[PDB]
């Protein structure tokens, strides 16, 4: 199925730490990666969980603009389920089940996991842009041809859903290959000397094929609105660098933030037993995308307001657009705040 697709773009306002599994190796709590390549990633389970929680919390306040009507959980449930609805309302009061809209879209709760599946699917969020310190200029966005390759693959997958031939052609228009150390750099990052763009601890050579970079910016303008998540897109167009695969992988491993944290005793004035530990944080301004898919709503006796893939897609688009999300652990210490552009 999955007759409709919405691309979600995330911008990290603050450093984000999505907790990995067992805390092994030298670093205590590392970010989630993939052994297959080594790049950072966010598994779809956490994304679906946070989206479901936000959706349910919004629905409980009757702030969800269901076709600009502010659908009421109790009223809609009574209209749909009729006689038994009241009983379900009690289950909603006990925080056992969930209101009608979120149950229909994201699937039911644990105790009722035998009626219908979830009408949505949330893919893993993959990196697309990585901040990196630079000598001239500051804070250069970086990316690699493999990322663009995966992006083209995702576009092709979308085309198998909505027949977006123009998007496929636009993606196929871009084809670059930096060999070992040369980079495609914007005008700002270029050192005042002859080429020689210096990223972190590496000195590179610029390559004069910047049109491709421009095309990439166009793709962004095609995908995530006009302003680049609240900034002038052309402003970011001056600070984009494309580098080889191995260099990008090296950046995605030895440039995440590393932080040491301690606990202070009540009155001793110094650390205590089991107080010192380490954490790894994904840098701010990291751009990561995903792929949300929607198929046929499998819920029984769905409401007339939301009874087609187009309706669900519109609801998701309006509810999540320039909104804000809390992602991962370390919430109370200001970590995980992101801006979502659909």
């Amino acid at each position: 199925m999955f007759e409709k697709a919405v691309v979600f773009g995330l911008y990290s306002i603050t450093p984000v730490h999505a907790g990995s599994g067992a805390e092994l190796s030298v670093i205590d709590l590392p970010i989630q990666r993939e052994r297959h390549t080594g790049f950072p990633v966010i598994w779809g389970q956490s994304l679906k969980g946070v989206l479901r929680s936000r959706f349910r919390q919004l629905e409980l306040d009757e702030k969800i603009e269901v076709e600009s009507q502010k659908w009421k959980w109790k009223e809609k449930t009574k209209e749909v389920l009729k006689e038994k609805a009241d009983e379900f309302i009690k289950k909603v009061e006990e925080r056992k089940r969930d209101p009608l809209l979120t149950e229909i879209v994201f699937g039911p709760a644990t105790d009722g996991a035998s009626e219908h599946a979830g009408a949505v699917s949330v893919g893993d969020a993959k990196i697309l842009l990585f901040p990196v310190r630079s000598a001239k200029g500051v804070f250069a966005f970086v990316t690699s041809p493999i990322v663009i390759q995966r992006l083209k693959e995702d576009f092709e997958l979308v085309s198998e859903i909505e027949n977006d031939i123009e998007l496929k052609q636009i993606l196929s228009r871009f084809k670059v290959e930096l060999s070992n150390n040369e980079t495609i750099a914007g005008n700002a990052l270029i050192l005042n000397g002859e080429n020689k763009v210096i990223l972190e601890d590496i000195v590179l050579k610029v390559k004069s094929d910047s049109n491709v970079i421009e095309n990439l910016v166009e793709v962004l303008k095609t995908l995530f609105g006009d302003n680049f998540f609240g900034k002038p897109i052309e402003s970011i167009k001056e600070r984009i660098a494309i580098v080889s695969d191995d260099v990008f992988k090296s950046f995605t491993r030895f440039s995440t933030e590393i932080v040491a944290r301690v606990r202070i005793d009540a009155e001793k004035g110094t650390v205590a037993r089991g107080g010192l530990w380490y954490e790894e944080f994904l840098p701010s301004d990291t751009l990561m995308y995903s792929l949300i898919a929607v198929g046929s709503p499998k819920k029984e006796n769905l409401p007339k307001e939301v009874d087609n893939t187009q309706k669900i897609v519109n609801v998701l688009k309006v509810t999540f657009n320039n909104a804000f999300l809390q992602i991962g652990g370390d919430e109370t210490v200001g970590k995980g705040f992101v801006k979502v552009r659909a």
Binding site: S25, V26, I27, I202, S250, R253, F254, I258
Partner: protein, 149 residues
């Protein structure tokens, strides 16, 4: 898991060898245990080359040229010097040859001096050497804390 067993055996062997020298002297045993514990922190902050340079610097001698071999830890005067020479010797030995030709891990440096190897190589060699040093240090921390006084 063969590499894991190799690392565990090597860590136990070096910690036992440290136990043999100045077994009663809790000064050398205590200093070495803290030195192994605090070592991985430096590597994360400053990289492998900087940590190796610091280890070379803390030794109190002319230290002409650079040699992972030689530099007998017992020849060092102060107990801290002996412990630091021991730590450097163990780490450099593991990175150079591991446990031997027939071992599962023959060492990434092909028997070469780790500092010279870092000085004349590519980036990826430095990366893998860094990761391997981090892993062996992680094992050595536990094994030295467990039994050494």
């Amino acid at each position: 898991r063969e590499i894991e067993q190799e690392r565990a055996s090597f860590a136990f062997k070096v910690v036992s060898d440290i136990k043999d020298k100045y077994s009663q002297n809790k000064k050398v045993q205590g200093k070495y245990s803290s030195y192994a514990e605090k070592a991985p922190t430096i590597i994360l902050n400053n990289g492998l080359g900087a940590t190796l340079a610091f280890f070379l610097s803390k030794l109190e001698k002319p230290i002409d040229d650079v040699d992972y071999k030689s530099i007998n830890p017992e020849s060092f005067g102060n107990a801290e010097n002996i412990a630091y020479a021991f730590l450097y010797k163990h780490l450099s030995t593991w990175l150079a040859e591991g446990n031997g030709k027939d071992s599962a891990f023959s060492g990434l440096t092909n028997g070469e001096d780790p500092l010279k190897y870092i000085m004349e190589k590519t980036a990826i060699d430095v990366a893998i050497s860094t990761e391997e040093a981090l892993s062996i240090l992680n094992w050595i921390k536990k094994f030295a804390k467990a039994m050494l006084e």
